[PDB]
A paper describes a structure:
AhlC provides the initial single leaflet insertion, assembly with AhlB then producing an oligomeric hydrophobic pore, and finally recruitment of AhlA produces a hydrophilic fully active AhlABC pore.
In the AhlB pore one of each of the subunit conformations of AhlB pack together to form a dimer and five of these Type 1/Type 2 dimers assemble into the decameric oligomer. Within the oligomeric pore, AhlB adopts two subunit conformations, which vary at both the tail and head regions. In the Type 2 conformation residues from both hinges adopt helical conformations, forming sections of α3 and α4, whereas in the Type 1 conformation, the hinge 1 residues in α3 (K152–L160) remain in a loop, indicating that the Type 2 conformation is the fully extended form. Furthermore, in Type 1 the N-terminal helix (α1) is sandwiched between helices α4 and α5, whereas in the Type 2 conformation the first 15 residues of α1 are disordered, with the N-terminus of α1 packing against the C terminus of α5 in an end-to-end arrangement. Thus, the Type 1 conformation has a five-helix bundle at the tail, whereas the Type 2 conformation has a four-helix bundle at the tail. Each subunit of the pore is constructed from two extended α-helices (α3 and α4) that join the head of the pore to the five α-helices that fold into the pore tail. In this soluble to pore transition, changes in ɸ and ψ angles of up to 180o for the hinge residues and movements of up 94 Å result in both the β-tongue and α3a/α4a (D156-L186 and G225-Q246) unpacking and the secondary structure rearranging to form the two 140 Å extended helices (α3 and α4), constructing the head of the funnel and presenting this hydrophobic head to the membrane.
Numbering used by the authors:
A (entry chain E): 54 to 105
B (entry chain E): 159 to 204, 207 to 341
C (entry chain F): 17 to 203, 208 to 337
D (entry chain D): 15 to 205, 209 to 337
The structure:
Amino acid sequence: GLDLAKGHADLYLNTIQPQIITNISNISNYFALQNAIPAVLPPGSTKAQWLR
Amino acid sequence: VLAQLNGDIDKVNAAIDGAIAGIVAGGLLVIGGAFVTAIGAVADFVGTSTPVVIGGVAMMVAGAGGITAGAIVLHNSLGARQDLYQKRSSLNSEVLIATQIGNGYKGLQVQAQNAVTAATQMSNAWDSLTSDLGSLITDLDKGITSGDDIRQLWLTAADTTVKTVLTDVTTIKAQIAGVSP
Amino acid sequence: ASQAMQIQTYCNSVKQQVPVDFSQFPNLKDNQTQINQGLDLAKGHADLYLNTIQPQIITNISNISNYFALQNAIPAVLPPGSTKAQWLRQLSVIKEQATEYQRLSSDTRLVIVNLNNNLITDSSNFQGIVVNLNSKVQGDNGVLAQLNGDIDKVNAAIDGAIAGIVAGGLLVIGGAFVTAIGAVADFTSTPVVIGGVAMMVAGAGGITAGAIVLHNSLGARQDLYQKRSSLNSEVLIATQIGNGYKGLQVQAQNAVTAATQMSNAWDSLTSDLGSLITDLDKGITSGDDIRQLWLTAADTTVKTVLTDVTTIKAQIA
Amino acid sequence: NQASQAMQIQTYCNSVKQQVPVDFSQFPNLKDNQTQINQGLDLAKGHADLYLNTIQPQIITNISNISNYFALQNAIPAVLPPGSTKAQWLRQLSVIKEQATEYQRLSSDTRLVIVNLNNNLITDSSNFQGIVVNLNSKVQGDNGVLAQLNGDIDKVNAAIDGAIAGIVAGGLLVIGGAFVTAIGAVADFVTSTPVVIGGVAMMVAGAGGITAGAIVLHNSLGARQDLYQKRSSLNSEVLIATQIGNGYKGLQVQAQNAVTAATQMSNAWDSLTSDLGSLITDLDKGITSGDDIRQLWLTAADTTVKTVLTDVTTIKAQIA
Ligand SMILES: [Cl-]
Ligand SMILES: [Cl-]
Ligand SMILES: [Cl-]
Ligand SMILES: [Cl-]
Ligand SMILES: [Cl-]
Ligand SMILES: [Cl-]
Ligand code: NA
Ligand code: NA
C-alpha cells in the first residue's frame, strides 16, 4: 500500500511538477511575444500585418 | 493480539508479585519458627511439648519453601517480562504507523484533488486568453478596432497588468527555488 | 544558507557519525544492525554528493553561465553588415547550442532526482531508527516501573530479617541476665534458670535464622537492582542515540527540501531554454516581420535564461 | 514581515483547502462531531475556492481599471485650459464626471462582493468555533468518566492483591502440612494421629486456598482488564478530539484574522466610493455654476482627485 503511495508521489514530483513549471515558462513566453507585437509593428501598419 | 499480550503481562506480574510475597512471608515463618522450635526444644527437656516443636519446624520448612520457591519463580520469570513489554510497545508503534500511512494517503488524495482544481483554473485562464485574442481578431477584421488603438491597449497593459504578471513569474520562480528576489 | 550549503552540512555531519555497538544489550541487537546499515548507506550517499554531484552541478551551470554571458542577446533585425545567409547560420548555431544546453539542464535534473531519493531514503531510515528506539524505551519503562515496585516489596523481607536479628540479640542479653539471677537464687530456682537459658537458645536461633533470611533477601534485592541498573543503562543509551538520529533526521529532511528547490530551479532553466529553442526555430522559418516577432521574443527569453542562471548560482553559494 | 490583507485571506484559504475530513467511526460518542466538522469543512473549502479564483481576481481587476483611468486623469482643469472653447472644456469635464460615476458604481459593486466575502469568512470562523466547543464538551465528559475508571481500577487491584495472598498462603500451608503429615506419620510407627490429621487438614485447606485464589485471580484480572480497556478507549477518544480540536482552534484564528482583513478591505473601498462621490458632486456643481464659483468647485474636484489616487494606493497596498 505504502510503496504504491510513494509511486503516486514520484509521479507528481518528477512528471507533473515539471509540467506545471513548464506552464510558467509558456506564460513567460506568451507575454514575451504579446509585448513584442507593438515593438515590431511601427505606428500605422496594415490591418493585414496585425492580423498575422 | 493486544488483549492477549496484556493478559500475559498481568499473569507474569502476578506470578512475580506472588513469588515476592512468598519470600517476605517465608522469611517471617523461618524466624518465627526458629524461636518456637527453640522454646519447644527446651520444654521437652522438662510434659508434652512435641506439638509445638513440630509446629515450629513446620513453620521453618514452609518458610524456607516459600523463599526458595519464590526465588525460582522470580529468576525464571524476570527475563520473560522484558520480552512481553517490548512486544506490546512494538505492536503499539506499528499499529500507530499503519494508521499514519492511511491518514497520509487521505491527505495525498486531498492534495491531488486540490491540484485538479488548480489545473482546471489554469486551463480556463488560457481559454479566456485564446477566446479574447479571437474576439480581437474578429473586431479588427470587421473594422470595429484598429492596430493603432490595439497598440495602445497592449502598451497600457505592458505598463501595468502584464508587467505585474511578469513580476509574479519572477517571484514564483524564486519562491520555488528557495531564493530572495 | 544556500541550498547546497544545507546539503553539504548534512553530508559532512552524517559522515562524522560513528557506528554503534549494543552488544551489551541483547534487547537492542536489531536496533544495532538497523542503525549501522542505515548509517553506512547514508555515508555512501553523502560521499556521492560531496565528490560527484555537487561539483557536477557547479560545472554544468558554469558552462551554461559562460555561454549565455557571451550570447546575452538575440539579434532580431539583421546586424550591421551581414548577408541574410550569414545571419541564419548565426541563429542556427545559437539554436543548436541552446538545444545542447537544454539537454545538459535536463540531465542535471536527473542527477538531482537521484540526490532527492538518496536524501529521502536517509531521512526515512533515520525516522525509522528513532521510532524503533522509542518503542524499546517505552517497553523498558513499563518493566522499570515494575522493578521499582518489586524492590520496594523485597525491602520488607530485609526489614523483617533485621527485626529477627535484633529480637534474637535482645533475648540473648535478656536470657543471660535471667540465667545469672536464677543461678544466684538458691540463696528453689531452676524453673527460671531454664527460662533464662531457653531465652538464650531461642535468641541464638532467631539470630542465625535472621542471618540466613537476611543474606538471602539482600541477594534477591541485589538481583533485582542489577536488572534495574541494566535497564537504566539501556534506556539511557537508546535515548542518547535516539536524539542523535532525531537530529540527523531533521538535517536530512532540510536537505530534501533544498534538493527539491534545486530540481524546480533546473526545471525552470530547461523549460525556459525550450521556449528559446522554439522562438529561434519559428524565427528562422518565418516571414519578414513574423521573423522579427519571434526573434524579439527569443531575446526576452534569453534575459529569462540569464535570470534562471543567477537563481541556480544563488542556490549554490 | 506583516502580510497584505489579501495575503492573509489567501493564506487562510490555502490552509483550509488542505485539510482532510475526519472519520470518527471508531468513536460512537463523536458521530455528531464528525458530521458537524465535515459539513463545516466542506462549506469552508467552497468559500476558499470562490475567494481564490473569483473574488480576489475581481478585486484586483476593478482596482486596476480605476487605477489606470485616474493615473491618466490625475487632475481636474479648474480654469479654461490654453486654447479651448468653453464648450469643449464643459464636454471634457462632463466626460470625466460620467467616467467617475462609472467607477463609483464599480467601487460600490466591489464593496458588495467584499460583504459576501466577509459573511463567508464569518460563517467559517463561526462553524469552527462551534467545532472546538463541541469537542471540548465531549472531552470534559470523558475526563469525568476517566477519573471514575482510575478509581475503579484502584479498587479492583485490592481483589487481585487478595487473590494472590490467598495463593501464597495456600502454598505455605501445603508445604507446612506436607512436613507435619510426614513427621506425624513416622511418629505413629513409634506409637500421633491428632497431628497427621492437622497436617492433612493444612494440606487440604492450602490446596483449597490455592484453587480458590486462582479462580478469584483469573476472574479479578479479567475485571481489571475490562476496566482498563474502557480507559484506553476513552484516552484514545480524548486524544483524537484534542488533536482535531487544536486543529480547528488554529483554523478559527486564521478565519478570524481573515475577517479583520476583509473588513479592512470593505472600509478601504467605502473611502474610495465616498471620495468618488465627492468628485462627482464637485464636477456637477462646477459645470452648472458662475465664473468664480465654477473655479471653486473645480479646484475642490482637483483636490478630490488627489484623494481618489491616495485611496487607490491604499487598496493596491491591501492587495500586495
Ligand atoms: Cl552492526
Ligand atoms: Cl552531467
Ligand atoms: Cl532503532
Ligand atoms: Cl465512545
Ligand atoms: Cl464587479
Ligand atoms: Cl465538533
Ligand atoms: Na540510509
Ligand atoms: Na468566500
